């Protein structure tokens, strides 16, 4: 029901491209720093597997072996009461080539667990970091989080890449982005907890 248990960890609680992650150990829930959806937030972007580069055995085996191949189950939680409103857009962008704020430097294309706060590569949410309007980003696997309707969003990302295994430290397969379309109106801040659990994680 509401107690998805994965490994030694336990938490309390939309298949991407209808292709379940599958093989050609390290499957646990990593709970990142909770983001504060203020009234003036423009979005968040998490790179995978770069977002898990320092998180225990997953982040260690990411740096030890060069080639790896991992799937994910992404839980994004915006806990709220029945008075709060707003909707977050959780999209998964394969090979999210960023546009610079000349190529974009490595420290920002690979930001790690913190990701890039778009309210601080280019941070213009209207062009999807690439000159494409944000509205046409709905072709990717998404789900709206309407506190009126929902409070959780789950995105099952398979391994999407052109080689069966690749260096996880130089290339992000997918990137989780959470962009607030309707602003938070409340009777002035609201936390977002993102917990990333790698599934079907393969190595060399």
């Amino acid at each position: 029901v509401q107690q998805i248990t994965l490994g030694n960890s336990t938490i309390t609680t939309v298949v991407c491209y209808a292709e379940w992650p599958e093989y050609l150990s390290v499957c646990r829930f990593y709970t990142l720093d909770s983001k504060t959806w203020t009234t003036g937030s423009k979005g968040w972007c998490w790179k995978l597997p770069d977002a898990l580069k320092d998180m225990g055995v997953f982040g260690q085996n990411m740096f030890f072996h060069s080639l790896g191949r991992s799937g994910y189950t992404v839980h994004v939680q915006c806990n709220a009461t029945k008075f709060h409103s707003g909707c977050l857009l959780v999209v998964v962008i394969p090979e999210h080539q960023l546009a610079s704020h000349v190529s974009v430097k490595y420290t920002f294309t690979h930001p790690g667990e913190r990701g890039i706060d778009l309210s601080s590569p280019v941070k213009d949410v209207i062009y999807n970091m690439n000159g494409t309007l944000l509205g046409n980003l709905l072709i990717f696997p998404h789900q709206f989080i309407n506190l009126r309707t929902n409070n959780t969003a789950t995105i099952v990302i398979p391994y999407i890449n052109s080689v069966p295994i690749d260096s996880m430290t130089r290339h992000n397969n997918v990137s989780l982005m959470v962009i607030p379309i309707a602003p938070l109106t409340v009777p002035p801040s609201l936390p977002i907890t993102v917990t990333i659990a790698p599934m079907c994680t393969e190595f060399s």
Binding site: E95, A99, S103, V122, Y127, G131, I139, S162, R170, H171
Partner: protein, 193 residues
């Protein structure tokens, strides 16, 4: 049946319009130079198709060598280099005014070419979508006058396949292989029909 990817991306486009002298030009095969083809290619992340070039050489006031240089072969540095005679570089000899036609297989290293690469191997500098290079030379010798042979290369993607549909591009391009951009939604009021 016109909405299939074999028909949408698989139409002969002119990927390069050059002009030679009676001297040469090398060109990295990059279909993304055409904003009409680039705007069609960027609705997909990976696309894999065999290539097919039909080359039309026209004079302006003869035999044209069309050499496909595969990945890893050396490009010519002079018109009289030894590389022009390397046996591994296929070349087609046709007259000016006629047209040449050949096909190159899928020469990428991955299972598809990379239209976008989120990482480093130079964020856009990737060797997976490198199809090689084309060099052209009018085989003649000290011809007493110089005739400029305009060459028109028509590439047609065949056996087209596409994945990971992407958001359509609304704004123009500024560089090759990079998504760096410099309002597309035109203003109307919102209630007026």
């Amino acid at each position: 049946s016109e909405t299939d990817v074999e028909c949408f991306l698989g139409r002969a486009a002119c990927v390069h319009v050059t002009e030679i002298q009676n001297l040469f030009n090398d060109w990295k095969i990059n279909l993304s130079s055409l904003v009409q083809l680039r705007k069609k290619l960027e609705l997909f992340t990976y696309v894999r198709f065999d290539s097919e070039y039909t080359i039309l050489a026209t004079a302006s006031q003869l035999v044209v060598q069309a050499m496909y240089v595969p990945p890893g072969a050396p490009n010519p540095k002079e018109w009289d280099d030894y590389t022009w005679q390397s046996a591994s570089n296929p070349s087609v000899f046709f007259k000016v005014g006629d047209t040449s036609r050949f096909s190159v297989p899928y020469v990428g290293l991955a299972s598809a070419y990379n239209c976008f690469y989120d990482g480093y191997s130079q964020y856009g500098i990737t060797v997976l979508n490198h199809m090689g290079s084309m060099a052209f030379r009018i085989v003649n010798e000290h011809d007493e006058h110089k005739t400029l042979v305009k060459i028109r290369v028509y590439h047609r993607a065949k056996h087209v396949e596409a994945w990971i549909p992407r958001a359509p591009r609304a704004l123009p391009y500024t560089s090759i292989g990079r998504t760096n951009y410099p309002p597309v939604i035109k203003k109307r009021d919102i209630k007026s029909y």
